[PDB]
C-alpha cells in the first residue's frame, strides 16, 4: 500500500478537450485539434492539417464523430479554426498565459500520432521563442522534448494543470520520426488569432511600419548598446503608426506590453497576429535611455476582383482609382483612370448598376470602359 504521483487525474479532465481530425488528385490526411468553445463547437488546429479540405470530420475522445466546417485560416501563422456541426455535450480547454512559461516547466502533449488514437506524451520546455523554420511565417515557437510525431499537429500542449500553453505544429526530424525536438505555437498567439477568425473569418493584419534586424552582440558593440538581444530599428516608414508614435531609427525594442522581447523575429510574430487598430505599448532603448511608447496598428466605394473602384461625378460611370499589378485585375487589362460606361450592353452609371449586372452572373463579362478619348472593351472568363 502506498501513493504514487500521476498525470492521470489531470488528464481525465483535459483529454476530452482534445479531438482528432480526419480530412479528405485526391488526398487523405489526419491530425489533431483542440476544443476552444464547447458551446459553439470551435476547434483550433494547424492550417496545414485542414488546408485544401473538401470534407472535415472530427472524432472525440469517447469515439463520437461530427462533421466540421472551416471558420478561418491563416497560413502565415499556420493556425486554422473549424467549427463542429451540431455541437452536443463538448468539453473545452482552459488556456494559460504562455508569457509565464519558463524553460524547465513540465509539458504534456496530446494528439493522434499515425492515427493510433488520442496519445499522451510528456516532457519539458526545451526553449522559447524559437524561429527560422520558415522566415516568411510568424513563428515564436515553444520547444519541447515531449514525443511529437505525424498526427500530433493541431494537438494540445498543456502544463501540469491541464491548461493549454501551445499548439504542437512541427518537429525537427531527419527521418520523419521524433528525435526530441518539437515545436508548438504559444497559447497567447492562438488566443489572438482565433478570436479574430471567430469575428471576421480572417485576420486583419496590422503593422508598425518599421524595418529592422536581429540585435546580436556584434551590432550592440557598434551601436554602443547594452542589450545583446532585441529588435533593432533600421528605419521607420513615413506616415506609419511607429513614426507617429515617435520611434526613430537606431532604436532597440526590448519589451512589448511589458513582456520582454526574445528577438526581432518574435516581435514580428507577436504583432503579426494582433488585429488592426490594436493599441499596444513598446519598450525602446535609445542612447542607453529607457523609453515607452503607445502605438496602434494600422492597415497597409467598392472593390471587385482585386480591383478598387468608385463612382464618377454624378452617374458618370465607375471610374478606376488605382490598380494592383500582381492582381488578376491588371491581368485582364484594367489600368488606372478607366471609366466603365457599361457592361454586357447594359448602361453603367454607378457601382449599383454595375453590380446589378454581376448579379446576373454571366458566363463572360464584357466591360465597355473608356481610356482618354477612346472607347474599348475588356473581357472576363
Amino acid at each position: 500500500a502506498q501513493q504514487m504521483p500521476s498525470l492521470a487525474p489531470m488528464l481525465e479532465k483535459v483529454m476530452p478537450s482534445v479531438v482528432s481530425i480526419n480530412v479528405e488528385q485526391k488526398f487523405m490526411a489526419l491530425g489533431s485539434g483542440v476544443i476552444i468553445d464547447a458551446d459553439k463547437g470551435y476547434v483550433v488546429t494547424n492550417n496545414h492539417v485542414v488546408d485544401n479540405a473538401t470534407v472535415i470530420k472530427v472524432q472525440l475522445s469517447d469515439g463520437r464523430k461530427f462533421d466540421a466546417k472551416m471558420v478561418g485560416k491563416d497560413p502565415r501563422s499556420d493556425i486554422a479554426l473549424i467549427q463542429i456541426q451540431n455541437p452536443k455535450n463538448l468539453t473545452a480547454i482552459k488556456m494559460a498565459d504562455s508569457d509565464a512559461l519558463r524553460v524547465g516547466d513540465y509539458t504534456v502533449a496530446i494528439g493522434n500520432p499515425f492515427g493510433l488514437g488520442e496519445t499522451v506524451t510528456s516532457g519539458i520546455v526545451s526553449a522559447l521563442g524559437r524561429s527560422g523554420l520558415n522566415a516568411e511565417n510568424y513563428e515564436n515557437f515553444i520547444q519541447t522534448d515531449a514525443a511529437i510525431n505525424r498526427g500530433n499537429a493541431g494537438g494540445a500542449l498543456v502544463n501540469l494543470n491541464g491548461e493549454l500553453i501551445g499548439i504542437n505544429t512541427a518537429i525537427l526530424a531527419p527521418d520523419g520520426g521524433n528525435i526530441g525536438i518539437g515545436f508548438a505555437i504559444p497559447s497567447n498567439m492562438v488566443k489572438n488569432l482565433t478570436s479574430q477568425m471567430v469575428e471576421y473569418g480572417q485576420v486583419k493584419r496590422g503593422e508598425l511600419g518599421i524595418m529592422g534586424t536581429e540585435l546580436n552582440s556584434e551590432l550592440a558593440k557598434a551601436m554602443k548598446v547594452d542589450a545583446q538581444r532585441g529588435a533593432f530599428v533600421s528605419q521607420v516608414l513615413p506616415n506609419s503608426s511607429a513614426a507617429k508614435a515617435g520611434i526613430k531609427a537606431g532604436d532597440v525594442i526590448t519589451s512589448l506590453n511589458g513582456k520582454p522581447i526574445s528577438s526581432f523575429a518574435a516581435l514580428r510574430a507577436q504583432v503579426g497576429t494582433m488585429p488592426v487598430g490594436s493599441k499596444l505599448t513598446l519598450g525602446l532603448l535609445r542612447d542607453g535611455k529607457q523609453v515607452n511608447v503607445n502605438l496602434e496598428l494600422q492597415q497597409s466605394f467598392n472593390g471587385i476582383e482585386g480591383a478598387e473602384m468608385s463612382n464618377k461625378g454624378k452617374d458618370q460611370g465607375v471610374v478606376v482609382n488605382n490598380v494592383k499589378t500582381g492582381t488578376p485585375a491588371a491581368q485582364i487589362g484594367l489600368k488606372k483612370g478607366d471609366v466603365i460606361i457599361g457592361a454586357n450592353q447594359q448602361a453603367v452609371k454607378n457601382i449599383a448598376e454595375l453590380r446589378k449586372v454581376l448579379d446576373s452572373k454571366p458566363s463572360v463579362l464584357a466591360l465597355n470602359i473608356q481610356r482618354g478619348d477612346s472607347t474599348i472593351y475588356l473581357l472576363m472568363q
Binding site: 494547424n46 494528439g111 499537429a153 494537438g155 505544429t169 518599421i210 534586424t213 526581432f264
Partner: peptide, 10 residues
C-alpha cells in the same frame, strides 16, 4: 530537416 506534423518589416 524541419517537417510539419536581411532587414525584415514589422
Amino acid at each position: 530537416w524541419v517537417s510539419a506534423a536581411g532587414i525584415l518589416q514589422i
